[PDB]
Amino acid sequence: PERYTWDETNFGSGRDTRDGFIQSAPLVVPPPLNGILTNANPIGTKNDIHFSNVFNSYGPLTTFSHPSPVYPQGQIWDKELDLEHKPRLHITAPFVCK
Amino acid sequence: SYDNQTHYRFLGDGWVEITALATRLVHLNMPKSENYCRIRVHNTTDTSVKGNMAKDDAHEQIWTPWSLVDANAWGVWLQPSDWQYICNTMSQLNLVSLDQEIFNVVLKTVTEQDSGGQAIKIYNNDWTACMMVAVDSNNILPYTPAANSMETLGFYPWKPTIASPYRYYFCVDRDLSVTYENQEGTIEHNVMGTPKGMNSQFFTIENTQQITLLRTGDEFATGTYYFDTNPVKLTHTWQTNRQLGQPPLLSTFPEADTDAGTLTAQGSRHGATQMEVNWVSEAIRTRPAQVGFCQPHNDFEASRAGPFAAPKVPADVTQGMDREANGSVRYSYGKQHGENWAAHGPAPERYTWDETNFGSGRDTRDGFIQSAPLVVPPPLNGILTNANPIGTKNDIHFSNVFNSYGPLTTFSHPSPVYPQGQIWDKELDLEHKPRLHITAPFVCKNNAPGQMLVRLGPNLTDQYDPNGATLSRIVTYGTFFWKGKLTMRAKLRANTTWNPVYQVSVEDNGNSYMSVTKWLPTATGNMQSVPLITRPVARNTY
Amino acid sequence: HFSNVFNSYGPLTTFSHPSPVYPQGQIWDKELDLEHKPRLHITAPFVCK
Amino acid sequence: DFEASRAGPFAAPKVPADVTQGMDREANGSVRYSYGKQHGENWAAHGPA
Amino acid sequence: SYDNQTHYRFLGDGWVEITALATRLVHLNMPKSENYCRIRVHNTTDTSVKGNMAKDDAHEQIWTPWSLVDANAWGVWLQPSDWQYICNTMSQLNLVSLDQEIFNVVLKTVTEQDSGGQAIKIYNNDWTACMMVAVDSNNILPYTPAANSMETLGFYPWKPTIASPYRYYFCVDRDLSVTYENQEGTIEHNVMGTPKGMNSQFFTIENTQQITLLRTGDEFATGTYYFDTNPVKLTHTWQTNRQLGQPPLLSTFPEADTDAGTLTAQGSRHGATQMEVNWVSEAIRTRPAQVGFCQPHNDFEASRAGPFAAPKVPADVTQGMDREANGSVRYSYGKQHGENWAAHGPAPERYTWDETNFGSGRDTRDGFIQSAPLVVPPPLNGILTNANPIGTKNDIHFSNVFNSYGPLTTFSHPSPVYPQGQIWDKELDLEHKPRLHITAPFVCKNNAPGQMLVRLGPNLTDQYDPNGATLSRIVTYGTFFWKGKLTMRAKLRANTTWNPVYQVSVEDNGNSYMSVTKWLPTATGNMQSVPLITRPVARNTY
Amino acid sequence: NTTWNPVYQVSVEDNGNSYMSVTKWLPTATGNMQSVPLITRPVARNTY
Amino acid sequence: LSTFPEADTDAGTLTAQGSRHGATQMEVNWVSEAIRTRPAQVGFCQPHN
Amino acid sequence: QTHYRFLGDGWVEITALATRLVHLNMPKSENYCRIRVHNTTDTSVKGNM
C-alpha cells in the first residue's frame, strides 16, 4: 500500500526540539551548565530521553489552529463522544457534529 | 472644543456610566522613507556569544511611511486621582463604546534661510498642504499595540505628544542553536533566512483603506465602535486549597488570647481524602478544585521564527519571592509614559508588577511530590523535592519543568496597571482561542477597534523626476488635536464586612511608596506617574 | 518515576464527569468567584452556573 | 502532587477515573471517605473509630 | 477622499462587477514652449549608413504646450495580486464604464533668492494662479496612447507621477532608398520634404475644447463614459489542424504503459482528403478550417511617410523559437512602468511576450510545400522547403514572403499584459476597419474615451511686451490628485476537467521566474513589476 | 485580495519531476492513474 | 529602528537592550524579542511518543 | 458533478453530487460472531509491544 506523511501548514505553531531549552532561577545572561537544561541532557538515566519527550507546554495562554483536511483519503465529519466533557477538537476529521 | 475630563453618571441599582474624555495635541514629521521598506535585523553582536541567545532580536519587519495613533493605555484617558476613586468604590468594570475625532490640522513648512549672516530657521504654514488619514475598520493590516512598546500617546494633557510610526512583521524563518557559558565547539548555525512564497504578506495602506485628505480647515470623525467584552473584577482573592469550605471541627477552646485551640485525632476524624491513609488533615483533604498551578520556569521554546519565552499566567509571588515563577511582569517606560522628568540619561525607569490574586501563586521551595502509596514520613528516594537535580543539572529541578495545569485548574484573570497598562486587545484569528490574554484585560469577542493611521501629504518641489534616483521634497511637518470618548459600565461594591477594608490612600511627604510629592510638580514643573494598586478591596472566592 | 510528575492533559484530552455516591455523597456546590472557572468540581456533581 | 502557596502545602486535586488492573488508586484520584453513625456506618461499632 | 482599491461585486449565474479605484498624485511644470511648435526630426546620423534604414526616425511632429493625462494601462488600476485572482478564476472580461475626477489642485511658485550668502531656492504657493483642463470628448484631436511610449501614469500608488506632454504627427512625405551592408554607390536620395496643402492639419487645444480654469480650492469631474466593446477570453487554446474532431480509429491496443497502439492501413482506411492519393493520414485529412497562418517575416513596406515594419498578428512561438515569425512583442519600460528601482544607468528593462494561443503559431523549419499531383516521396525540384534560396538570396526563403491568410484562416485574439499592457484603443476613421488591434485588446466600436489634457496657467510678470521677442514669466509648477473609476463585467470559469489545471502561482525565494522577492520591497524600499501570465487555464477550441 | 504581492496558488506543472506533475492525475496507455493528496490552505492568512 | 540600511545588502539595528522601552516577565534590566511579553502562546510542546 | 451557486456578499452554495455503483456478496457469517484477536507472534518479543 502506498503511504504519505502530511505535515501541517500552520507555521508558527510547530516546534523544534533541538533549540528548545529551559533556564533556571533568576535568569542569567550566559547560563552556567547546571543552570540550563537542553535537548542534550539525559533524563532518568537514559541518553536519548530528554525533557522534550516528556514535556507538556499546554496551558491557558496556549492557543492554536485547527488541522486542515486532506483532499483524497481525508475524513470529513465525525460523531462526538458521549462524554460529559468534550475535547476541544478531533484529529480524525475537521468537522464534529455539535 | 477641547476637553479632557471624566464624568461619572450614576444610575439605579448601583451601576455607573463612566465617561472618559481625552484631548491631546499631536506632532508629526515627514516620514523619511518615501516608500515601504522590507528591512531585516540581525544582532550577530550578541547571538554569536555562547551564553547569549535569550537576547536574540532577529527578524524582518516592514517599515511603512505611516504613523499609527494608538491610545490603548489607561494612563492617557483617566486621571491619576480618578483611577483611585474607581478602584476604591467599584467592584467590576467593562468597556462599552469608543469614539474618536480629529481637528485643527496645522501644516507648516521650514525654510533654513539666512546663509548671509549665520544659519537661522524660518517657519510658516501652508494651507494647500494636506494630511492623510485612514482607519483599518475591517482590521486587514496586522495588529500593532502601541503599548506593546510604550509608544502610545502622552499621559499628561498639558504636554503634547507624537505618534509611533507603523511597522509590522514578516516571514523569514530564523534559526539558532543552543549553547551555555563557554561550552566547547561552535554555535553550529545561527542562520537568518529568505522569504517563503507561502507566507509572504506585503500589505499597503493605499490598497487597504480609504484614505482621506485633510487640509488646514478640515477635520475628521470616526464612527462609534461598541465594545463586546467581559467585565473584570476590581477585587483580589486570597483563599487557597487550604481555605475552601467547612474548616475542621474544634475540640479545644483557647483559655487566653495567647494559646490556640486543637482539632480531633487525625485517625479518628471524619472527612474524605484521595489517599489510602486512614486519617485526615488539611493538607490532604479533598478540595472543590485547584487554585492556580505550577508553571514551567523560564520555558524557552522555538519554532521557525526562533527561540522565545513562553508566556505564563501572572499570579501571586508568594512568600517565596518567586517572580519569574508566577509570571510577574517588569515594565520599562519613559517620560511621556511615566518616569520622573528630572531623570538624566536615556535610562528608562522600570517596575515589576506582582499580581494580587493571592492563593493562586506558588512557592517552589515548599513544592514537593511523594511516591506510590503515600507514606507518613517519606524515605529519601520516595519523595522528590526542589533540591533534587534533574537531567544531571544541579539548579534544574522539577519545578522548572512541571506543568500542573488541568481540568480542576481554576484561576483569576490578571488585573490591569493604571499608567502604561494596556486596555483592550484584538483576538487571534485562530480556530481555537486562548482562555485569555496577558497583554491586556479586555479582548474583543468579535471584531476589534480599527487601528488609526496618519501620514503627511508628500509635498513636492519644482524639480521632480520619477526615474531619478532619490529626489527632493519641500520640508514639512504638522500638528493636530485628538479627542477621544470612552464610555464604560461598572457597579459599586457593597460594604458587607465590618472591619474596614484596605483602601488606596496617599501619605504625607515621606519615604512611603504612597508619597504625595510623587504625583506633584517640582520647582521647575517635573513629575512622574507611578503605577497604582488595582483591586484594593478583598473579595472571597468560596 | 516520570509517572509521578507527568501531566498528559491537553486539547484532545476528553473525559467523563465523576458519578456521585449515594450516602455521604454531596449533591450541588457553589461556583468559585473566579474569572475563569474550572471545567468541573469533584466535591459534587452539580455546580450552579 | 503537593503544591504550596501563602496558605501552605496541600494535595493538588485530581480528576477521578478508573483504577485499572494496576490497582493504582492514588494514581486515578479515587476517593476515601470517613463517615460515622448518622452518615452511615454500623451502629453496633464500638470506639470513636 | 483618496482611494485606491479593487472591489469584486458578485452577482447571479457567475457574473461579477469588478470595480477599479485608482487615485494618484500628479506633478506638472511650466510648458517650456509658450507656443505650438512644428519641429522636424531627421536622424541623418544613422539614415546615411548603407545597412541602416530600419532605424529611420524621420518625421515632423507638432509640439503643444499641453500635457496629456493617460491612464490606459492595467498596471495603473489593478494591483499585482488582483490580476492574479482574476486570471485564475475568470473565463472572460470586458470593459463597462469609465469615470475620472481631479481635485486638491496645488499651485506654487519658486524664488531662487539668497544671492548674498550662497544660492538657496524658496518655495511658496499661489491661489490666484490657475491650472487649465479640457477633455477632447468628441475626439477631434489625434489619438495619442501614453502606453504607446510607456509614458502613462505611475503603477505604484504611494509614488507620485507626472504627465506626458502632448504632441502629434504631421504630413511631410519622407523618402529613403534601399541599401545593404556596404553595397556600392550612394544612398540615392534620403530626402525629407515640405508640408503639402492638402494634408496640412494644425489643431489648437484652444479652438477645439472648452478649457476650464481650476485654482487652489477648485476641482473637476468628468461624465461617465460607457464602453461599447467585445469581451476577451481569459484562457488559451492548443488544438491545431491535427487535433480537430474525430481522431483516427484504433486497431491496436497497448500491452503495457510503455508501447503505443496503431491505426488502420492508410490505403484501406475511411475518411476524406483534398489530395488525389488513395490513402489517408492525419497530415492530409480535411479539417474544419485553418488554425493560424504563415506571415511574411520582417516585411518592411513603404509609403509617402517612409519605411516601416508591417504589424503581424501575435501567435504561439512554437518549438522553432520563431519570435519575429509569430509577431511576439518586446517591451522597454522603466521605473514607474515596472523595472527594478535599484537598476543603475538609463538602461531600460526589456521583455519579449510570447503569445499562449498554441496551435496557432508556426515553425518555419518544418514548413514546406509540395508540387502538382502530390507524390509520396517528393523529388527535389518537386518540393520547396525552408532551405531553398529565393531571388538569388541564401537566407531569404519562401517563409519570409509567404502569406497564408485566407477565408478558412481563423485565429485567436491576443491577450493583454498586466503591467505596461494597454487597455482600450480608438478605432481608425477608415471606411473598412481591421479585424482587430494589437496595440490593445479592446477597441471602442463607436466613439472612444475623450483624451484628457492639462496645462498650467501662464503666470506673467510686470514686464510684458507682446511684440518683444521672448519675455519672462514667474516660475511656477503644480500638483493635483486624480481619481479614476473603472467598472468591468466578467464571468467565473467552470471547473469541468478533472486533472488540476495550470494556475498562476508564486514561489519561495529562488531562481524561479515566479519568485516572491520580485514583488517585495528591498532594505531601502526598491521593487519591480514583472509582467504576468494571462490565460493560465486551458480552454478548448473544438 | 488585499495583499499586493501575488499569493501562493495550488498550480500544476508540465511533465517533470515536480511534485505537481500533470501526468500524475492523467490516465496511462492502459488507463491507470492515481490520486495524490493536495495542499489545503494555499493562501496565507494573518493571526494578529 | 535606530539604524537605517545604506544599500540593499546590510541591515538596520535597534536600540540598546538595556536602555530600550518595553516590558518582559524577567528580572533582567533590558529588552529583547526572545524575552518580550506576548499576547499568548502560539502552539506548544507535546510529549514525544 | 459539482455545482457552485453564487450568492451575495461573496457566499457560495457548493453542491456535491456523487453517484456510484456498489457490489455486495453473501455475508459468510450467517450469525453475529464475537471473535478475538491476539498477535502473540509479536507481543512475545521483548522490544515489541
Q: What is the 3 state secondary structure string of E279-300?
A: CCCCCCECCCCEECCCCCCCCE
Interface test with C, best of G41, G45, G46 (most C CBs within 10 A): G46
Cell numbers placing E174: 519622407
Q: Hey, which residues does E26 pair with through a beta bridge?
A: E161, E480
Q: What share of chain G is helix, strand, coil (3-state, %, to 5)?
A: 0, 10, 90
Give the closest-approach CA distance of D40 to chain B in angstroms: 12
Buried b (16+ CB within 10 A) or exposed e, B30-42: bbebbbbbbbbbb
The burial class, CB within 10 Å (0-12 / 13-18 / 19+), for A36 is buried
> Alpha helix (H) ranges present in E78-150?
80-89
Give the closest-approach CA distance of E85 to chain H in angstroms: 14
CA distance A29 to A23: 10
CA distance E388 to E374: 19
CA distance E420 to D34: 87
Cα B61 to chain center, whole Å? 21
- Pick from B275, B288, B404: which is nearest to D32 by CB? B275
- Name every chain C residue with its beta carbon within 8 A of the beta carbon of B539: 33
Run of H or E residues at B68: strand B62-68
Contact B516, B507 (CB under 8 A): yes
Give the closest-approach CA distance of E233 to chain H in angstroms: 21
CA distance E479 to E108: 9
CA distance C35 to B404: 19
| Phi and psi angles of residue B329, each rounded to the nearest 5 degrees, phi first | -110, 145
CA distance B222 to E370: 79
DSSP 8-state class, residue B366 = T
CA distance B264 to B366: 26
Tell whether B265 is within 8 A of chain A (Cβ). no
Q: Which of B375, C27, B397 is nearest to D26 (CA)?
A: B375
Query: Given an 8 Å threshold on Cβ–Cβ distance, is A72 in contact with F47?
Result: no
Q: How many C-beta neighbours within 10 Å does residue B470 have?
A: 7
Tell whether H14 is within 8 A of chain E (Cβ). no
**Nearest-5° Cα angle at B345, B342 to B351:** 75
Data resolution in angstroms: 4.2
Q: Which of B222, B129, B137, B166 is nearest to B479 (CA)?
A: B129
Buried b (16+ CB within 10 A) or exposed e, E134-153: bbbbebebbebbbbeebbbb
Instruction: Using the structure block, give the residue that is written with the C-alpha cell 516528556.
Output: A54
Query: CA nearest C11 in A: which residue?
Result: A88
Which residues, in sequence order, are CB contacts of B204 under 8 Å at separation 6+?
B36, E157, E158, F4
Cell numbers placing B319: 512568600
Q: Which of E221, E207, E217 is nearest to E129 (CA)?
A: E217
Distance between first and last Cα of chain A: 35
Touching chains, G (3+ CB pairs < 8 A): A, B, C, E
Query: CA nearest B399 in C: which residue?
Result: C5
Chains C and D touch (3+ CB pairs under 8 A): yes
> Alpha helix (H) ranges present in B182-322?
none
Interface test with B, best of G3, G9, G27, G33 (most B CBs within 10 A): G33
Which residues, in sequence order, are CB contacts of F9 under 8 Å at separation 6+?
E84, E88, E503, E504, E505, E506, F42, F43
Cell numbers placing E269: 482506411
Run of H or E residues at B127: none
Give the closest-approach CA distance of C5 to chain B in angstroms: 7
- Pick from C6, C13, C36: which is nearest to A87 by CB? C13
Cell numbers placing B46: 550578541
- Pick from B54, B348, B436: which is nearest to G32 by CB? B54
Going by the annotation, the residues of the binding site of E are 138
Give the closest-approach CA distance of G37 to chain B in angstroms: 7
Q: How many C-beta neighbours within 10 Å does residue A20 have?
A: 23
- Name every chain C residue with its beta carbon within 8 A of the beta carbon of G46: 10
Query: CA nearest E341 in G: which residue?
Result: G8
Q: Which amino acid makes up residue G14?
A: L
CA-only gyration radius of chain A, Å = 19
- Name every chain G residue with its beta carbon within 8 A of the beta carbon of E526: 8
Contact A21, A36 (CB under 8 A): yes
CA distance B16 to B19: 9
Query: Given an 8 Å threshold on Cβ–Cβ distance, is G11 in contact with E524?
Result: no
CA distance B542 to B240: 10
Going by the annotation, the residues of the binding site of E for Mg(2+) are 138
Q: How many C-beta neighbours within 10 Å does residue B71 have?
A: 25
Contact B312, B292 (CB under 8 A): no
CA distance E390 to B54: 79
Interface test with C, best of D3, D14, D15 (most C CBs within 10 A): D15
- Name every chain A residue with its beta carbon within 8 A of the beta carbon of F38: 70-72
Instruction: Give the 3-state secondary structure of E80-145.
Output: HHHHHHHHHHEEEEEEEEEEEEEEEEEEEEEECCCCCCCCCCEEEECCCCCEEEEEECCCCCCCCC
Interface test with E, best of F2, F4, F22 (most E CBs within 10 A): F4
CA distance B253 to B436: 46
Q: Which amino acid makes up residue B94?
A: N
- Technique used: X-ray
Contact B186, B66 (CB under 8 A): no
Which residues, in sequence order, are CB contacts of E58 under 8 Å at separation 6+?
E41, E42, E43, E47, E174, E176, E192, E306
- Pick from A12, A70, A73: which is nearest to F40 by CB? A70
Give the closest-approach CA distance of B211 to chain G in angstroms: 26
Query: CA nearest F43 in A: which residue?
Result: A9
Q: How many C-beta neighbours within 10 Å does residue E357 have?
A: 26
Tell whether E500 is within 8 A of chain H (Cβ). no
Contact G21, B148 (CB under 8 A): no
CA distance A37 to A50: 9
CA distance B177 to B306: 9
- Name every chain H residue with its beta carbon within 8 A of the beta carbon of E492: 4, 6
Q: Hey, which residues does B15 pair with through a beta bridge?
A: B491
Q: Which amino acid makes up residue E455?
A: R
Question: Which pairing describes strands E476-492 and E15-29: parallel, antiparallel, or unpaired?
Answer: antiparallel
Cα B121 to Cα B160, E123, E255, G34, distances in angstroms: 22, 14, 91, 44
Interface test with C, best of A85, A91, A96 (most C CBs within 10 A): A85
Which residues, in sequence order, are CB contacts of E48 under 8 Å at separation 6+?
E187, E190
Distance between first and last Cα of chain E: 50
Contact B149, B134 (CB under 8 A): no
3-state secondary structure of E476: strand
Which of B 33-62 lie inside 8 A of D, CB atoms?
A: none
The burial class, CB within 10 Å (0-12 / 13-18 / 19+), for G45 is buried
Distance between first and last Cα of chain H: 46
Give the closest-approach CA distance of C18 to chain D in angstroms: 6
3-state secondary structure of E44: helix
Contact B343, B327 (CB under 8 A): no
Cell numbers placing B163: 505618534
Contact B107, B127 (CB under 8 A): yes
Half-sphere exposure at residue E521, Cβ-oriented, CA atoms within 13 angstroms: 25
Query: CA nearest C8 in G: which residue?
Result: G47
CA distance B364 to B385: 9
Cα B180 to Cα B44, C10, F44, distances in angstroms: 17, 32, 37
Q: How many C-beta neighbours within 10 Å does residue E28 have?
A: 21
Dihedral, CA of residue E167, residue E172, residue E173 and residue E176, to nearest 10: -70
Listed by the residue before each break, gaps in chain E with C–N over 2.5 Å are none
Q: Which of B311, B415, B405 is nearest to B356 (CA)?
A: B415
Cell numbers placing C34: 473566579
CA distance E85 to F7: 9
- Name every chain G residue with its beta carbon within 8 A of the beta carbon of E528: none
